[PDB]
UniProtKB/Swiss-Prot annotation, chains A, B:
Cysteines paired by S-S bonds: 17-30, 20-38, 41-56, 59-73, 63-81, 83-94, 100-118, 121-136, 142-161
Induction field: Up-regulated by TNF.
Cell compartment(s), UniProt: Cell membrane
Protein name: Tumor necrosis factor receptor superfamily member 21
Glycosylated residue positions: 32, 91
PTM annotation: Oxidized in response to reactive oxygen species (ROS), leading to endocytosis.
Full-protein interval shown: 51 to 214 of 655
Quaternary structure and partners: Associates with TRADD. Interacts with NGFR. Interacts with CASP8.
Role: Promotes apoptosis, possibly via a pathway that involves the activation of NF-kappa-B. Can also promote apoptosis mediated by BAX and by the release of cytochrome c from the mitochondria into the cytoplasm. Trophic-factor deprivation triggers the cleavage of surface APP by beta-secretase to release sAPP-beta which is further cleaved to release an N-terminal fragment of APP (N-APP). Negatively regulates oligodendrocyte survival, maturation and myelination.
Length: 164, 164
């Protein structure tokens, strides 16, 4: 664990104290006859690193709705805000991901910062349900089924498999 | 930040959740539509690493007197006990460092785990005060003083400097 220099109030001695670990702050500096004492950051506050400071940092303001916390305000971390799952950040706030319609599928997964990116199902694949998550699905392989295609698929529906 | 797998109670889905940072524990696991929620370790408890666990570890028992804390019980660390400054650990407890008598000096600084190690002052050095900390001190250089030695030093006293 690292150290820091401190000027001792009563004697003017410059001491080398031990740092306090992340999550605590120095509640009493060392002196020439005693170790520094660390205390844990009070609720509302944090320190991210081993430090020599006498108060913990205040955590940021609560997340503005509909945003939620992906990290809490805890001893070691400020809160960290995010658009909840299924939404992404645009400018001010959060907006629901695009829903890829039937006949389209996700090409790029939506994130907390970017929207879903849809593409038309390519030939041989289909998507039969609106979804901001699912990808185009390959047709059932009628060949390796011992069957043949009774009815072709579309970008929206699987091909239908059978015989005669 | 790392992840862990969790079996979702209601659906049996095996999800990949985000870990909770050191100092917190997982107070709600992720599900397919919501992020895991971390809470900070309650007073008395700790976690040292980013983790997926549902309770923090209990801190060890208070330090047995005359031992004191060199780390507190805080969110990120169990308490850690030490013999206070000026004492070192031997077996059961703490014992005061050796005091090097006049005519001796510290050869090796005492620690929380080992005692001071004294040596007789070597020629040209002296120590005039009992101390578990101070080293033998070189005589005042009467030459580079423009003076001469009126009275030789001993292992206990400086040489005395003057003229005629």
């Amino acid at each position: 664990i690292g150290t820091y220099r401190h000027v001792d109030r009563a004697t003017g001695q410059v001491l080398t104290c031990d740092k306090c670990p992340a999550g605590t702050y120095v509640s009493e500096h060392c002196t020439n006859t005693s170790l520094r004492v660390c205390s844990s950051c009070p609720v509302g506050t944090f320190t991210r690193h081993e430090n020599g400071i006498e108060k913990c940092h205040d955590c940021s303001q609560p997340c503005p709705w509909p945003m939620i916390e992906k990290l809490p305000c805890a001893a070691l971390t400020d809160r960290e805000c995010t658009c909840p799952p299924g939404m992404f950040q645009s400018n001010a706030t959060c907006a629901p991901h695009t829903v890829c319609p039937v006949g389209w599928g996700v090409r790029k997964k939506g994130t907390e910062t970017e929207d879903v990116r849809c593409k038309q199902c390519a030939r041989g694949t289909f998507s039969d349900v609106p979804s901001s998550v699912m990808k185009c699905k390959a047709y059932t392989d009628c060949l390796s089924q011992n069957l043949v295609v009774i009815k072709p698929g579309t970008k929206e529906t699987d091909n239908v498999c059978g015989t005669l």
